[PDB]
Amino acid sequence: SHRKFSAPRHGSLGFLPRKRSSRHRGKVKSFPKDDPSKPVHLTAFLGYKAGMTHIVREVDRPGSKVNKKEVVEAVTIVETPPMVVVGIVGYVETPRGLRTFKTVFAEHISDECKRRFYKNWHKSKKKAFTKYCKKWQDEDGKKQLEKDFSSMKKYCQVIRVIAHTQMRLLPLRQKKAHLMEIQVNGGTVAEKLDWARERLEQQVPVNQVFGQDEMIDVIGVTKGKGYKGVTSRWHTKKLPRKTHRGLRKVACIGAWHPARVAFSVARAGQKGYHHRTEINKKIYKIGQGYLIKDGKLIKNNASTDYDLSDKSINPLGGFVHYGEVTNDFVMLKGCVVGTKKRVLTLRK
Amino acid sequence: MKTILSNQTVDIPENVDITLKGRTVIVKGPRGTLRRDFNHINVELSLLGKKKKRLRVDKWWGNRKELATVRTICSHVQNMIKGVTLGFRYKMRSVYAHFPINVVIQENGSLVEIRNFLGEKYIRRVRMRPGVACSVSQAQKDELILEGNDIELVSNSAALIQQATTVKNKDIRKFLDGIYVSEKGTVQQAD
Amino acid sequence: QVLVLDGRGHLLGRLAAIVAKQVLLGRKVVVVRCEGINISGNFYRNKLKYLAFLRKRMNTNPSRGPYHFRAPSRIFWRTVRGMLPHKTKRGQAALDRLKVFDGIPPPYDKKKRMVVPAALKVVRLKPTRKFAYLGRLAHEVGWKYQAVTATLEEKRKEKAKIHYRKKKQLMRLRKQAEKNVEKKIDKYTEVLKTH
Amino acid sequence: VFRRFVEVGRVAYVSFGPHAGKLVAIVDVIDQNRALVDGPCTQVRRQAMPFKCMQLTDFILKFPHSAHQKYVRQAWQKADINTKWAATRWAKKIEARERKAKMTDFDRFKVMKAKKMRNRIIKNEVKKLQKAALLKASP
Amino acid sequence: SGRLWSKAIFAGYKRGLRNQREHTALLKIEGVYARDETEFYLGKRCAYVYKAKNNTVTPGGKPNKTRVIWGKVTRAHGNSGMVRAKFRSNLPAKAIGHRIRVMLYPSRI
RNA sequence: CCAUCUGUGGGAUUAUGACUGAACGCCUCUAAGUCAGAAUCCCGCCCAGGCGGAACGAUACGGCAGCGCCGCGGAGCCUCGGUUGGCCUCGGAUAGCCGGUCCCCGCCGGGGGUCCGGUGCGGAGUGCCCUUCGUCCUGGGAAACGGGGCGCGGCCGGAAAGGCGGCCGCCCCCUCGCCCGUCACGCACCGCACGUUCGUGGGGAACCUGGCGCUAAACCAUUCGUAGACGACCUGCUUC
RNA sequence: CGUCGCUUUUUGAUCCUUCGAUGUCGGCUCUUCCUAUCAUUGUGAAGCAGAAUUCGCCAAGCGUUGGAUUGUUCACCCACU
RNA sequence: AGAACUGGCGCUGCGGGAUGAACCGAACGCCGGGUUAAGGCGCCCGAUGCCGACGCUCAUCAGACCCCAGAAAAGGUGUU
């Protein structure tokens, strides 16, 4: 009793279900709450991290000892082909939180979209929305589709936009779109909505939502490490060498008189594949890649104002376990949640 | 004891007239208006008579601790009637040691930015309650004048300056710095 | 069939006692606008004894154990659950009738609400003593949907004031209609017999 | 505010107790919550009824302070209260309230037939004021 | 045409605090709320009407899924004016909170 | 931590400090009233999402099936509870509601006179259908909408749970839908229980039955490995 | 000089429970909790000029280590903070 | 730990004391009616759903029924 030497906690109780996330895409818990004084824009965005390289920058921090000198810094580059806005969803709040009022999809939807709405593309007859596209085309539902905008505009309060990645531009095996639902923090809710009515099934790059040196947040799903016990999952101390029944355990998992094991205590279970939300990553360089066909292919990436070589950001022989970066990208200071070839969602 | 009744009498001069929507008191005078609602205190207010405007607040049975609050009614009404014919000029005088405190007003007579208090890099924005007025007194060193109708809001304004310029972690018997109030007076002097 | 209790202006236990008996007799009550429920005593006392309830927590996992609700909908509800024999099935089924609602919902806004004079703030407190709201302490503890109910309190009160506009308009004429002729042969049987 | 008080000579109604329904006249107060009443021409004799029992009217009288029974009796009927209590719109309310309980069951039938006749006339005539409020503004 | 009885919810059994007596009921009938005006309701014949799956008909003709349990009012109970009762069977104890039918029978008027 | 990367602000207040100000003619931070106020307290940020709820998609043929929505009556099985519904001011309680001129919000609703009512009668101890046996024969008062509906179709109103409410324009048809009376009949079942509704209630199974439509999928085996102790998840599969 | 208590972190007093057994000192490992606060924040009082200390209040959110001897709880000592 | 008088549990239920050997009532065949005991009468829970009567008391740790399950010295312009 009375430990005789105070020790801090092992692990955090704020992440207590050390448990597989219910999801594969990084769900955004809370978009930044809209102030309509700003011009109309998005917040969140989908992107696939590829690998890491590093960088040399002229640091500029007057007051520090680092200043005016070359620093190497770890970056991570994230391949972001442009999204396609397909749907609009309006929410109305209740006294029980936001309730999804109603949805509007696109006029015609692409091919990798419908592959998300099925668990097996081969066996299926690819029949999604084939009785939905008639009410954009025939007039009979078409005057009650604009009813669904007129009653959208009056009642709903925060509108969100169903958009997804383009998998045709990505070197993986997957070919399922990652469909999302991202919030416009625009002005008045008519003009917050009159911006997204313009642009169903039209592409949106990253350099409109994000810019150079805009500090964003990363939401994504962590490493798959497996099923690992106490001193590995929670980093509790190994026992001394003499110990019968095991070196690698925690020993005392409770008192007597609470005759019941607490939740606070560390014990064996599943390590990794958790959902996490990284905060305050800095964008360094918005990249554009592999332009038009007249100049038959100009590559020209990895080009500062001082290295100045017709290069490409993928390394000499492709990234390890990724593929080959062909698209627009985002590069970010430091290490970022998730394995290679794994979707992670960005956020202002 | 539960005494039968108690009553004060409040006279109103002729250039100010008081109307009520119930317990709420609306006072309008020469230099504006101000109003106070007494929606919590449970005592009737009685205007009586034309040409003269005698006010007579009277409280019936009551316990003694509710008997004590009826004088508080007439002592708050006679700081609106005076506050709408005269208003309250508060003269706070700055005292300083080796460092001279310097002070400005930015927003129209409502915001006060105090600097070089005792030797800080830190400035102090003392935003006032809406309805009072700033004034730096001239023909006098470092005197700050606060005006307005409502004696709560003027003294609430005059407290947030005296309480912001406080020396901490030191002797406060000595190290006498600050912006202390010195005199609460009238705007229309002697009327 | 159903009775509807307007909830404002009442005390907590002095109303919830009466509901707990009327729901044990096979009736169906719906308490509406349970935000303006009062509670006797000053506010900071009624906030201490609800933070004292929040420190009650079982020390092996709180996910089982005392479920501290926060909305004043489910605060009045957990009080009434205290006054019914919920561990037996006769007290389980006396919760299949009480449907507390906060704000005034659209199934229950267009009914003539009934109030309880046996539980009001006017009657039961001595007027010189201090009283809290169930609404604003639930604002202090976790119920973060306060203003988006007071946004909807006025948006119902806006459309209700326009009904009273035209209910008295459909009542102002029938006083003018009874100023017309040939009814007084049938006023004769009612003025004699309590019109 | 507080338009009618208690006073030596205030006619008061008595809603309940062992003297329910009849009037009194306050002769003197004794200790705040109780008071001394008597009534000469309303058959309630001189005793102490409490204030939460009773019920105040508008009628003051002119008494000496706690005089004998005879000096209530003259100033009562010099004021002639039961006439001034008759044609008021509050004693008609209590007398209507007691007519309806003792209403015999055939008299419930006569009311029921002759109530709906004036409902099937007022409802069929206030509907025309709805017709005449909109033919006006039809241009 | 017309209803000829009084609505009367079934409140409990005549209980102590631990044990209850099955052999007398007690009824809160709708309308009376004092002991002064329960003198009308004394000795009135009351009945609990419910359903079954089987068919039988006491009166009339054709049988049906309805059967009844009789009873009568015994005496008053408490100043709130509910009424203890005494049926010729004991109650099913489902009936708590349900009402029964209390007739206009056995008049002394 | 032996390499690198990041770690988050709002509110009510405690202690203390004041204001205004009585009690007690002053005074007083308090008796009522207010203000500042922090590693504490709650929330956000952050993690999981329930015997909780939405929105939206797709809804099974072949060779004969089979299945929705709407119109159906016939019979059978089971679960039971009810016996008319009130279609809504805000709030105040040392105060309140009615009707009403003057000068204000795109021809209504807002502020003040004044007039009523008030132990609430423009009164849920109240109100309206109503306790409607039905019908005929016949006369007086009330009446110019007819009112159910398979209606026919249109219209906007009401999102916090819209599942709910009115109008217009035609129509098989009603000119007997109510009060006061004239005249006479229907099971008048021989004193007697579960009658009178809701309601052609809620359930699932099958046959004769009109009009409209509907031609999917999941899971597994197979593959991948962003994942895995096995399940779970992640993906792939076209005759290009 | 007195006098009123609290507390069960010290021993003692008692034998109520356990003798068909409740595994009994100390350390190592890990979690929680109390507040009679050493430090950190807010503050008030000094024989508070500043610095440095001392007394009380709100306060358990977060900290309260590295070793020599001892088998030790304790004790002692160097070093840091 | 040890006594004296008498009662009580042990051997004994039931009502009440939330719960209990021993308190307060009260002692037992099986039952139907009526009434009270100790106790209680916001709702769990039968009964004040009385127009109960008179005064006191506000706590940022209120107080709330013998044994009985938490308290003193001392102090207060908190209030009579």
From Swiss-Prot, chain B:
Supply one GO CC term from the record.
Answer: cytoplasm
Do you know which SUPFAM superfamilies this protein is assigned to? Answer: Ribosomal protein L6
Q: Where in the cell is it found?
A: Cytoplasm
Check the record and name the Gene3D superfamilies matching this protein. Answer: Ribosomal protein L6, alpha-beta domain
Q: Where is the major localization of this protein?
A: cytoplasm
InterPro entries, A to Z? Ribosomal_uL6-like, Ribosomal_uL6-like_a/b-dom_sf, Ribosomal_uL6_a/b-dom, Ribosomal_uL6_CS2
N6-acetyllysine PTM sites in chain numbering: K121
Report a single Gene Ontology molecular function.
Answer: RNA binding
Any one of the GO BP annotations: cytoplasmic translation
The reply on keyword Cytoplasm is: yes
Q: Is Amino-acid biosynthesis one of the keywords UniProt gives this record?
A: no
Record text on subunit structure and interactions: Component of the large ribosomal subunit.
| Protein task | Component of the large ribosomal subunit. The ribosome is a large ribonucleoprotein complex responsible for the synthesis of proteins in the cell.
Q: Which PANTHER family match?
A: 60S/50S RIBOSOMAL PROTEIN L6/L9, LARGE RIBOSOMAL SUBUNIT PROTEIN UL6
* Family, similarity comment: Belongs to the universal ribosomal protein uL6 family.
Tell me the protein's name.
Large ribosomal subunit protein uL6
From Swiss-Prot, chain C:
Species this protein is from: Homo sapiens
Q: Which Pfam families match?
A: Ribosomal_L13
GO molecular function term, any single one: RNA binding
Domain of life assignment = Eukaryota
Listed InterPro entries: Ribosomal_uL13 (IPR005822), Ribosomal_uL13_CS (IPR023563), Ribosomal_uL13_euk/arc (IPR005755), Ribosomal_uL13_sf (IPR036899)
Protein name per UniProt: Large ribosomal subunit protein uL13
Where does the record place the modification Phosphoserine? S73
Gene of this entry: RPL13A
Any Gene Ontology biological process: lung morphogenesis
What's the PTM story here?
Phosphorylation at Ser-73 upon interferon-gamma treatment in monocytes involves a DAPK1-DAPK3 kinase cascade and is causing release from the ribosome, association with the GAIT complex and subsequent involvement in transcript-selective translation inhibition. Citrullinated by PADI4.
The record describes its quaternary structure and partners as: Component of the 60S ribosome. Component of the GAIT complex. Interacts with EIF4G1.
Entry similarity comment: Belongs to the universal ribosomal protein uL13 family.
Where Citrulline occurs, the residues are R55, R136
Its annotated compartments are: Cytoplasm
Q: Which residues carry this modification: N6-acetyllysine?
A: K187
Q: Keywords on this record? A: Acetylation, Citrullination, Cytoplasm, Phosphoprotein, Ribonucleoprotein, Ribosomal protein, Translation regulation
- What Gene Ontology cellular-component terms does the record carry? cytoplasm; cytosol; cytosolic large ribosomal subunit; cytosolic ribosome; focal adhesion; GAIT complex; large ribosomal subunit; membrane
From Swiss-Prot, chain D:
The signal peptide, as residue positions, is none
* Residues recorded as bearing N6-acetyllysine in the entry: K78, K84
**One GO BP annotation here?**
cytoplasmic translation
GO cellular component entries: cytoplasm; cytosol; cytosolic large ribosomal subunit; cytosolic ribosome; extracellular exosome; membrane; postsynaptic density
The reply to whether Transmembrane figures as a keyword in the UniProt entry is: no
UniProtKB keywords: Acetylation, Cytoplasm, Isopeptide bond, Phosphoprotein, Repeat, Ribonucleoprotein, Ribosomal protein, Ubl conjugation
Asked if RNA-binding is a keyword of the record, the answer is no
Where, per the database record, does this protein carry N6-succinyllysine? K84
Q: Where in the sequence is Phosphoserine found?
A: S138
Gene Ontology molecular function, alphabetical? cadherin binding; RNA binding; structural constituent of ribosome
Point out the cross-link Glycyl lysine isopeptide (Lys-Gly) (interchain with G-Cter in SUMO2) in this chain: K123
The principal localisation class reads cytoplasm
Q: Where in the cell is it found?
A: Cytoplasm
What does the protein in this record do?
A: Component of the large ribosomal subunit. The ribosome is a large ribonucleoprotein complex responsible for the synthesis of proteins in the cell.
Similarity section:
Belongs to the eukaryotic ribosomal protein eL14 family.
**Assembly notes:** Component of the large ribosomal subunit.
Identification of the protein by name: Large ribosomal subunit protein eL14
What organism is this sequence from? Homo sapiens (Human)
Which gene codes for it? RPL14
Portion of the full-length sequence here: 2 to 140 of 215
UniProtKB/Swiss-Prot annotation, chain E:
Disease entry from the Swiss-Prot or TrEMBL record: Diamond-Blackfan anemia 5: A form of Diamond-Blackfan anemia, a congenital non-regenerative hypoplastic anemia that usually presents early in infancy. Diamond-Blackfan anemia is characterized by a moderate to severe macrocytic anemia, erythroblastopenia, and an increased risk of malignancy. 30 to 40% of Diamond-Blackfan anemia patients present with short stature and congenital anomalies, the most frequent being craniofacial (Pierre-Robin syndrome and cleft palate), thumb and urogenital anomalies.
What is the superkingdom listed in this entry's lineage?
Eukaryota
Principal location class? cytoplasm
The answer to whether the entry has keyword Transferase is no
The protein, known as? Large ribosomal subunit protein eL33
Record's Gene3D superfamilies? translation elongation factor selb, chain A, domain 4 (2.40.10.190)
Pfam family name, one: Ribosomal_L35Ae
Q: How does it assemble?
A: Component of the large ribosomal subunit.
GO cellular component terms, A-Z: cytoplasm; cytosol; cytosolic large ribosomal subunit; cytosolic ribosome; extracellular exosome; membrane; synapse
